[PDB]
CSV table of all heavy atoms in Angstrom, one decimal:
chain,number,residue,atom,x,y,z
B,204,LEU,N,-22.9,-54.0,2.1
B,204,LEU,CA,-23.5,-53.8,0.8
B,204,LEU,C,-23.5,-52.3,0.5
B,204,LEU,O,-23.4,-51.4,1.4
B,204,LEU,CB,-25.0,-54.3,0.9
B,204,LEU,CG,-25.3,-55.7,1.1
B,204,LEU,CD1,-26.1,-55.8,2.4
B,204,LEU,CD2,-26.0,-56.3,0.0
B,205,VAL,N,-23.5,-52.0,-0.8
B,205,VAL,CA,-23.5,-50.6,-1.2
B,205,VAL,C,-24.7,-50.4,-2.2
B,205,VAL,O,-24.9,-51.3,-3.1
B,205,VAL,CB,-22.3,-50.2,-1.9
B,205,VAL,CG1,-22.5,-49.0,-2.9
B,205,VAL,CG2,-21.2,-49.9,-0.9
B,206,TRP,N,-25.6,-49.5,-2.0
B,206,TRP,CA,-26.8,-49.2,-2.8
B,206,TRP,C,-26.6,-48.0,-3.6
B,206,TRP,O,-26.2,-47.0,-3.1
B,206,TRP,CB,-28.0,-49.1,-1.8
B,206,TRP,CG,-28.2,-50.3,-0.9
B,206,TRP,CD1,-27.6,-50.5,0.3
B,206,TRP,CD2,-29.0,-51.4,-1.0
B,206,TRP,NE1,-28.0,-51.6,0.9
B,206,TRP,CE2,-28.9,-52.2,0.1
B,206,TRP,CE3,-30.0,-51.8,-2.0
B,206,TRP,CZ2,-29.6,-53.4,0.3
B,206,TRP,CZ3,-30.7,-52.9,-1.8
B,206,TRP,CH2,-30.6,-53.8,-0.6
B,207,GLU,N,-26.9,-48.1,-4.9
B,207,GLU,CA,-26.8,-47.0,-5.8
B,207,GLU,C,-28.1,-47.0,-6.7
B,207,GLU,O,-28.7,-48.0,-6.9
B,207,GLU,CB,-25.5,-47.1,-6.7
B,207,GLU,CG,-24.3,-47.0,-5.9
B,207,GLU,CD,-23.1,-47.5,-6.7
B,207,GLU,OE1,-23.3,-48.1,-7.8
B,207,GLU,OE2,-21.9,-47.5,-6.2
B,208,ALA,N,-28.4,-45.8,-7.3
B,208,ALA,CA,-29.5,-45.6,-8.1
B,208,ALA,C,-29.0,-45.0,-9.5
B,208,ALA,O,-28.1,-44.1,-9.4
B,208,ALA,CB,-30.6,-44.8,-7.5
B,209,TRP,N,-29.7,-45.3,-10.6
B,209,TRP,CA,-29.3,-44.7,-11.8
B,209,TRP,C,-29.8,-43.3,-11.9
B,209,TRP,O,-30.7,-42.9,-11.3
B,209,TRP,CB,-29.9,-45.6,-13.0
B,209,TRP,CG,-29.3,-45.2,-14.3
B,209,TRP,CD1,-28.0,-45.3,-14.6
B,209,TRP,CD2,-30.0,-44.8,-15.5
B,209,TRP,NE1,-27.8,-44.9,-15.9
B,209,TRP,CE2,-29.0,-44.6,-16.5
B,209,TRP,CE3,-31.3,-44.6,-15.8
B,209,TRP,CZ2,-29.3,-44.2,-17.8
B,209,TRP,CZ3,-31.6,-44.2,-17.1
B,209,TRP,CH2,-30.6,-44.0,-18.1
B,210,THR,N,-29.0,-42.5,-12.6
B,210,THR,CA,-29.2,-41.1,-12.8
B,210,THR,C,-28.9,-40.7,-14.3
B,210,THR,O,-28.6,-41.6,-15.1
B,210,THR,CB,-28.4,-40.2,-11.9
B,210,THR,OG1,-27.1,-40.7,-11.8
B,210,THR,CG2,-29.1,-40.2,-10.5
B,211,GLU,N,-29.0,-39.5,-14.6
B,211,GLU,CA,-28.6,-39.0,-15.9
B,211,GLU,C,-27.1,-39.1,-16.2
B,211,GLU,O,-26.6,-39.6,-17.2
B,211,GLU,CB,-29.0,-37.5,-16.1
B,211,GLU,CG,-28.5,-36.9,-17.5
B,211,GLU,CD,-28.9,-35.5,-17.6
B,211,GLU,OE1,-29.6,-34.9,-16.7
B,211,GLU,OE2,-28.6,-34.8,-18.6
B,212,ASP,N,-26.3,-38.8,-15.1
B,212,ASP,CA,-24.9,-38.9,-15.2
B,212,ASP,C,-24.4,-40.3,-15.0
B,212,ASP,O,-23.5,-40.8,-15.7
B,212,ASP,CB,-24.2,-38.0,-14.2
B,212,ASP,CG,-22.7,-38.2,-14.1
B,212,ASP,OD1,-22.0,-37.7,-15.0
B,212,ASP,OD2,-22.3,-38.9,-13.2
B,213,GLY,N,-25.0,-41.0,-14.1
B,213,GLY,CA,-24.7,-42.4,-13.8
B,213,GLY,C,-25.1,-42.9,-12.5
B,213,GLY,O,-26.3,-42.9,-12.1
B,214,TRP,N,-24.2,-43.5,-11.7
B,214,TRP,CA,-24.4,-44.2,-10.4
B,214,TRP,C,-23.8,-43.4,-9.3
B,214,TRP,O,-22.6,-43.2,-9.3
B,214,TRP,CB,-24.0,-45.6,-10.4
B,214,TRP,CG,-24.7,-46.6,-11.4
B,214,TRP,CD1,-25.6,-46.2,-12.4
B,214,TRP,CD2,-24.5,-48.0,-11.6
B,214,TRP,NE1,-26.0,-47.3,-13.1
B,214,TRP,CE2,-25.4,-48.4,-12.6
B,214,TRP,CE3,-23.8,-48.9,-10.9
B,214,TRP,CZ2,-25.5,-49.7,-13.0
B,214,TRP,CZ3,-23.9,-50.2,-11.3
B,214,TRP,CH2,-24.8,-50.6,-12.3
B,215,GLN,N,-24.7,-43.1,-8.3
B,215,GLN,CA,-24.2,-42.4,-7.1
B,215,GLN,C,-24.7,-43.1,-5.9
B,215,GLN,O,-25.7,-44.0,-6.0
B,215,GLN,CB,-24.7,-40.9,-7.1
B,215,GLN,CG,-24.4,-40.1,-8.3
B,215,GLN,CD,-25.5,-40.3,-9.3
B,215,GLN,OE1,-25.9,-41.4,-9.6
B,215,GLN,NE2,-26.0,-39.1,-9.8
B,216,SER,N,-24.0,-43.0,-4.8
B,216,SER,CA,-24.4,-43.6,-3.5
B,216,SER,C,-25.7,-43.1,-2.9
B,216,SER,O,-26.0,-41.9,-3.0
B,216,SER,CB,-23.3,-43.5,-2.5
B,216,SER,OG,-23.7,-44.0,-1.2
B,217,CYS,N,-26.6,-43.9,-2.5
B,217,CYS,CA,-27.8,-43.6,-1.9
B,217,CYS,C,-27.8,-43.9,-0.4
B,217,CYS,O,-27.5,-45.0,0.0
B,217,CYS,CB,-29.0,-44.4,-2.5
B,217,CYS,SG,-29.0,-44.4,-4.3
B,218,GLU,N,-28.2,-42.9,0.4
B,218,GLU,CA,-28.1,-43.0,1.8
B,218,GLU,C,-29.2,-43.9,2.3
B,218,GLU,O,-30.3,-44.3,1.6
B,218,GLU,CB,-28.3,-41.6,2.6
B,218,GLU,CG,-27.6,-41.6,3.9
B,218,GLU,CD,-27.8,-40.2,4.6
B,218,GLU,OE1,-27.1,-39.3,4.1
B,218,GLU,OE2,-28.6,-40.1,5.4
B,219,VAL,N,-29.2,-44.4,3.6
B,219,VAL,CA,-30.1,-45.3,4.2
B,219,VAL,C,-30.5,-44.7,5.5
B,219,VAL,O,-29.7,-44.2,6.3
B,219,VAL,CB,-29.5,-46.8,4.4
B,219,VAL,CG1,-30.4,-47.6,5.3
B,219,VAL,CG2,-29.3,-47.4,3.0
B,220,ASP,N,-31.9,-44.7,5.8
B,220,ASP,CA,-32.4,-44.2,7.1
B,220,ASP,C,-32.7,-45.4,8.0
B,220,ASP,O,-32.3,-46.5,7.8
B,220,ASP,CB,-33.6,-43.4,6.7
B,220,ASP,CG,-33.9,-42.4,7.9
B,220,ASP,OD1,-33.8,-42.8,9.1
B,220,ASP,OD2,-34.3,-41.2,7.6
B,221,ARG,N,-33.3,-45.0,9.2
B,221,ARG,CA,-33.6,-46.0,10.2
B,221,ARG,C,-34.6,-47.0,9.7
B,221,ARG,O,-35.6,-46.7,9.0
B,221,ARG,CB,-34.2,-45.2,11.4
B,221,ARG,CG,-34.7,-46.1,12.6
B,221,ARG,CD,-36.2,-46.3,12.5
B,221,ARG,NE,-36.9,-45.4,13.3
B,221,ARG,CZ,-38.2,-45.2,13.3
B,221,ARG,NH1,-39.0,-45.9,12.5
B,221,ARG,NH2,-38.8,-44.2,14.1
B,222,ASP,N,-34.3,-48.2,10.2
B,222,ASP,CA,-35.2,-49.4,9.9
B,222,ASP,C,-35.1,-50.4,11.0
B,222,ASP,O,-34.0,-50.5,11.6
B,222,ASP,CB,-35.1,-49.9,8.5
B,222,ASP,CG,-36.4,-50.2,7.8
B,222,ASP,OD1,-37.4,-49.7,8.3
B,222,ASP,OD2,-36.4,-51.0,6.9
B,223,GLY,N,-36.1,-51.2,11.1
B,223,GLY,CA,-36.1,-52.2,12.2
B,223,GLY,C,-35.4,-53.5,11.9
B,223,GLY,O,-35.3,-54.4,12.8
B,224,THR,N,-34.9,-53.7,10.7
B,224,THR,CA,-34.2,-54.9,10.3
B,224,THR,C,-33.0,-54.6,9.6
B,224,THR,O,-32.7,-53.6,9.0
B,224,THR,CB,-35.1,-55.7,9.3
B,224,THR,OG1,-35.3,-54.9,8.1
B,224,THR,CG2,-36.5,-56.1,9.8
B,225,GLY,N,-32.0,-55.4,9.9
B,225,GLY,CA,-30.7,-55.2,9.4
B,225,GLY,C,-30.4,-55.8,8.0
B,225,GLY,O,-29.3,-55.8,7.5
Side-chain angles (χ1 to χ4, degrees):
Chain B
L204 301 118
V205 161
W206 306 80
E207 297 163 356
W209 195 54
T210 44
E211 175 182 1
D212 171 80
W214 292 11
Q215 313 84 310
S216 173
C217 312
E218 207 181 285
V219 167
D220 201 318
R221 173 261 269 170
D222 221 20
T224 61

